[PDB]
Enzyme design. Structure first.
Site, PDB file in Angstrom:
ATOM      1  N   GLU A 168       0.806  -1.229   0.000  1.00  0.00           N
ATOM      2  CA  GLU A 168       0.000   0.000   0.000  1.00  0.00           C
ATOM      3  C   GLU A 168       0.839   1.279   0.000  1.00  0.00           C
ATOM      4  O   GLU A 168       0.542   2.218  -0.736  1.00  0.00           O
ATOM      5  CB  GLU A 168      -0.965   0.019   1.189  1.00  0.00           C
ATOM      6  CG  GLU A 168      -2.079  -1.034   1.159  1.00  0.00           C
ATOM      7  CD  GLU A 168      -3.106  -0.865   0.025  1.00  0.00           C
ATOM      8  OE1 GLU A 168      -3.037   0.130  -0.703  1.00  0.00           O
ATOM      9  OE2 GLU A 168      -3.971  -1.750  -0.141  1.00  0.00           O
ATOM     10  N   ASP A 205     -12.360   7.416  -8.503  1.00  0.00           N
ATOM     11  CA  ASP A 205     -13.609   7.985  -8.023  1.00  0.00           C
ATOM     12  C   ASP A 205     -13.462   9.395  -7.424  1.00  0.00           C
ATOM     13  O   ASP A 205     -14.460  10.001  -7.042  1.00  0.00           O
ATOM     14  CB  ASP A 205     -14.330   6.996  -7.073  1.00  0.00           C
ATOM     15  CG  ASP A 205     -13.736   6.936  -5.674  1.00  0.00           C
ATOM     16  OD1 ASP A 205     -12.743   7.633  -5.389  1.00  0.00           O
ATOM     17  OD2 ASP A 205     -14.252   6.163  -4.832  1.00  0.00           O
ATOM     18  N   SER A 222     -11.757  10.171  -4.679  1.00  0.00           N
ATOM     19  CA  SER A 222     -11.332  10.086  -3.271  1.00  0.00           C
ATOM     20  C   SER A 222      -9.810   9.971  -3.257  1.00  0.00           C
ATOM     21  O   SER A 222      -9.188   9.875  -4.301  1.00  0.00           O
ATOM     22  CB  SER A 222     -11.984   8.913  -2.553  1.00  0.00           C
ATOM     23  OG  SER A 222     -11.548   7.681  -3.095  1.00  0.00           O
ATOM     24  N   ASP A 274      -6.391   8.166  -0.966  1.00  0.00           N
ATOM     25  CA  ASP A 274      -5.915   7.202   0.045  1.00  0.00           C
ATOM     26  C   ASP A 274      -4.747   7.794   0.793  1.00  0.00           C
ATOM     27  O   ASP A 274      -3.890   8.456   0.156  1.00  0.00           O
ATOM     28  CB  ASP A 274      -5.423   5.914  -0.626  1.00  0.00           C
ATOM     29  CG  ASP A 274      -6.527   5.061  -1.175  1.00  0.00           C
ATOM     30  OD1 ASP A 274      -7.729   5.257  -0.932  1.00  0.00           O
ATOM     31  OD2 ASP A 274      -6.152   4.090  -1.831  1.00  0.00           O
ATOM     32  N   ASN A 310      -9.069   5.425   2.667  1.00  0.00           N
ATOM     33  CA  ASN A 310      -9.731   6.381   1.768  1.00  0.00           C
ATOM     34  C   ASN A 310     -10.644   7.437   2.401  1.00  0.00           C
ATOM     35  O   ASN A 310     -11.200   7.255   3.486  1.00  0.00           O
ATOM     36  CB  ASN A 310     -10.455   5.655   0.628  1.00  0.00           C
ATOM     37  CG  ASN A 310     -11.810   5.133   1.019  1.00  0.00           C
ATOM     38  OD1 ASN A 310     -12.740   5.910   1.262  1.00  0.00           O
ATOM     39  ND2 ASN A 310     -11.949   3.807   1.060  1.00  0.00           N
ATOM     40  N   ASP A 352     -15.385  -4.504   8.916  1.00  0.00           N
ATOM     41  CA  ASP A 352     -16.550  -4.049   8.110  1.00  0.00           C
ATOM     42  C   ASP A 352     -17.307  -5.194   7.445  1.00  0.00           C
ATOM     43  O   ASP A 352     -18.424  -4.986   6.985  1.00  0.00           O
ATOM     44  CB  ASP A 352     -16.121  -3.016   7.056  1.00  0.00           C
ATOM     45  CG  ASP A 352     -17.312  -2.430   6.236  1.00  0.00           C
ATOM     46  OD1 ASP A 352     -18.209  -1.803   6.821  1.00  0.00           O
ATOM     47  OD2 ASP A 352     -17.333  -2.585   4.993  1.00  0.00           O
TER      48      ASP A 352
HETATM   49 YB   LIG Z   1      -5.597   2.968  -3.574  1.00  0.00          YB
HETATM   50 YB   LIG Z   2     -19.159  -1.680   4.258  1.00  0.00          YB
END
Ligand SMILES: [Yb+3]
Ligand SMILES: [Yb+3]
Ligand SMILES: [Cl-]
Ligand SMILES: [Cl-]
Ligand SMILES: [Cl-]
Ligand SMILES: [Yb+3]
EC number: 3.2.1.17
Length: 129
Positions: free
Chosen positions: A35, A48, A50, A52, A59, A101
């Site tokens: 990452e 999109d 957004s 990170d 995000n 999540d």
């Molecule tokens: Yb990413």
């Molecule tokens: Yb979710």
């Protein structure tokens, strides 16, 4: 801050990520490697619109507030800039929410594509823990 491999493993362990939601320490270190290359200051724009942030590339659409992401929910209740700090507490706290999540670490696409099912223990090999 650019962490060393074992340095980050130690910091993650101290902040309770080791075996969190069943994911061994090597999984988290592997995720951080791909990452952010262990760099807390990493930022990357998504398609999109957004962005990170930080070692675990969290995000701004769902998790942190950056002030420029339409639809922002800020479920971690933090400014995205707090995810860039040399202290990883904020990133860790928020990652604990993310991995809870429902899809586990699949929430990190780089984890799914590059760490999942691999010898992740290699990431903590040789570290004092
Ligand atoms: Yb990413
Ligand atoms: Yb979710
Ligand atoms: Cl490395
Ligand atoms: Cl491991
Ligand atoms: Cl899971
Ligand atoms: Yb130990």
């Amino acid at each position: 801050k650019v962490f060393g491999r074992c340095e980050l493993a130690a910091a993650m362990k101290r902040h309770g990520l080791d075996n969190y939601r069943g994911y061994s320490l090597g999984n988290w270190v592997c995720a951080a490697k791909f990452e952010s290359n262990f760099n807390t200051q990493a930022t990357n724009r998504n398609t999109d619109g957004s962005t990170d942030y930080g070692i675990l590339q969290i995000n701004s659409r769902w998790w942190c507030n950056d002030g420029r992401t339409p639809g922002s929910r800020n479920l971690c209740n933090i400014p995205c800039s707090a995810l860039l700090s040399s202290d990883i507490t904020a990133s860790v706290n928020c990652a604990k929410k993310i991995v809870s999540d429902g899809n586990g670490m699949n929430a990190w696409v780089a984890w799914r594509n590059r760490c999942k099912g691999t010898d992740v223990q290699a990431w903590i090999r040789g570290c004092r823990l």
